[PDB]
Amino acid sequence: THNQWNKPSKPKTNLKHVAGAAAAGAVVGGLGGYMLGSAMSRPMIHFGNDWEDRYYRENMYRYPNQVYYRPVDQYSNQNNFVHDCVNITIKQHTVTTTTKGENFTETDVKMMERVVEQMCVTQYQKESQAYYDGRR
Amino acid sequence: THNQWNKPSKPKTNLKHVAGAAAAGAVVGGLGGYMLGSAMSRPMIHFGNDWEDRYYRENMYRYPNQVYYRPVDQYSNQNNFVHDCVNITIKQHTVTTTTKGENFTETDVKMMERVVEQMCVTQYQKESQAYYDGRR
Amino acid sequence: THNQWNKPSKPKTNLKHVAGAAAAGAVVGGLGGYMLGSAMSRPMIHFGNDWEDRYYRENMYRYPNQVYYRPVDQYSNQNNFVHDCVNITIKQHTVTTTTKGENFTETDVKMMERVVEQMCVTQYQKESQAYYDGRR
Numbered sequence: 541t542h543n544q545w546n547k548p549s550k551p552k553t554n555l556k557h558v559a560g561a562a563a564a565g566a567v568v569g570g571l572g573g574y575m576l577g578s579a580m581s582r583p584m585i586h587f588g589n590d591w592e593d594r595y596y597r598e599n600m601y602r603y604p605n606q607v608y609y610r611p612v613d614q615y616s617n618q619n620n621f622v623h624d625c626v627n628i629t630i631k632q633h634t635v636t637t638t639t640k641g642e643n644f645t646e647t648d649v650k651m652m653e654r655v656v657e658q659m660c661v662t663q664y665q666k667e668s669q670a671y672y673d674g675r676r
Numbered sequence: 677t678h679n680q681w682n683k684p685s686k687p688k689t690n691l692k693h694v695a696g697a698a699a700a701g702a703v704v705g706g707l708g709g710y711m712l713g714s715a716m717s718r719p720m721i722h723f724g725n726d727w728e729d730r731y732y733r734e735n736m737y738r739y740p741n742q743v744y745y746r747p748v749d750q751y752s753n754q755n756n757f758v759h760d761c762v763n764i765t766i767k768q769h770t771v772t773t774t775t776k777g778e779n780f781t782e783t784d785v786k787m788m789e790r791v792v793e794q795m796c797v798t799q800y801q802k803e804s805q806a807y808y809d810g811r812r
Numbered sequence: 813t814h815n816q817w818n819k820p821s822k823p824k825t826n827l828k829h830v831a832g833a834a835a836a837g838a839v840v841g842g843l844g845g846y847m848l849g850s851a852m853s854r855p856m857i858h859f860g861n862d863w864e865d866r867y868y869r870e871n872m873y874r875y876p877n878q879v880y881y882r883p884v885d886q887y888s889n890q891n892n893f894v895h896d897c898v899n900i901t902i903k904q905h906t907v908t909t910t911t912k913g914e915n916f917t918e919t920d921v922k923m924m925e926r927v928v929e930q931m932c933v934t935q936y937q938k939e940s941q942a943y944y945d946g947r948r
């Protein structure tokens with residue numbers, strides 16, 4: 541004989557942003573031949589009555605990851621790598637408040653001239669040769 | 677004999693952004709021959725009576741990942757890589773408030789001249805030769 | 813003998829953005845021969861009574877992923893890569909408020925001249941030869 545009763549009264553339940561999996565990653569340049577990991581979300585969430593018996597689950601798992609990097613004659617040049625440039629700013633900022641004023645003069649002057657040439661990420665490369673043969 | 681009763685009273689239940697799987701990734705340049713991971717979202721959520729018995733599930737799992745990178749003659753040039761450039765800004769900003777004023781003069785003046793040449797991501801490359809043979 | 817009763821009272825239930833799978837990925841340049849991961853969303857959400865017995869599911873799973881990168885004579889040039897450029901802005905901004913004013917003068921003056929040449933993503937490449945043979 542097996543009995544299960546579930547009588548919750550006004551069970552307000554919220555599940556926001558639960559069990560999310562995300563496999564990602566940023567790669568700039570490099571010589572390849574690499575492996576990025578996987579993402580697994582496997583939660584068991586239970587409310588109420590759970591009854592289990594005489595089962596056999598989730599056995600004999602294997603996760604063999606192999607990276608075999610065997611180049612023979614590899615010639616490479618890697619120059620001027622950057623990931624990202626964020627929140628570069630130049631500003632002239634004024635905040636003026638006057639709750640109550642009489643017979644007053646306010647003047648705001650903002651000058652910008654020849655402020656900048658480059659703000660970020662200026663990349664220059666002239667002569668790159670992975671293999672150069674200039675004998676004699 | 678088996679019995680399952682489920683009598684919740686006003687069970688307000690909310691599930692938002694649950695069990696999402698996202699496989700992604702950004703790659704700039706590189707020499708290839710790589711593997712990015714997968715995303716698995718596998719949650720079990722139960723609100724009530726759960727009864728299981730004499731079952732056999734989720735066995736004999738294998739996840740073999742091989743990256744085999746064997747180039748023989750590889751000549752490569754990689755120059756001037758960037759992922760992204762975000763939130764670059766130049767601004768002249770004024771905020772003026774006058775709740776109550778009499779016989780007043782306000783002046784806002786803004787001049788911008790020759791401010792910038794390149795705000796970001798300027799890439800220049802002149803001479804690249806993966807293999808160069810200039811004998812004699 | 814088996815019995816299952818499900819008599820919830822006013823069960824307000826909401827499922828929003830549940831069990832979404834998204835396989836994506838951005839690649840700029842590179843030498844190919846890669847593999848991007850997959851997305852699997854496989855949730856089990858149950859309200860009420862669940863009764864399982866003498867079952868056999870989800871066994872003998874294999875996920876063989878192989879990347880085999882074996883070029884022989886690979887010559888390549890990669891120059892001036894960028895993924896994206898976002899939120900580049902130049903602005904002159906003024907916010908003036910006068911809840912109650914009498915006999916006042918307000919002036920807003922904004923000039924822009926020669927402000928910028930390029931905002932972002934300026935790419936220049938002159939001479940690229942994967943294989944160059946200039947013997948004698």
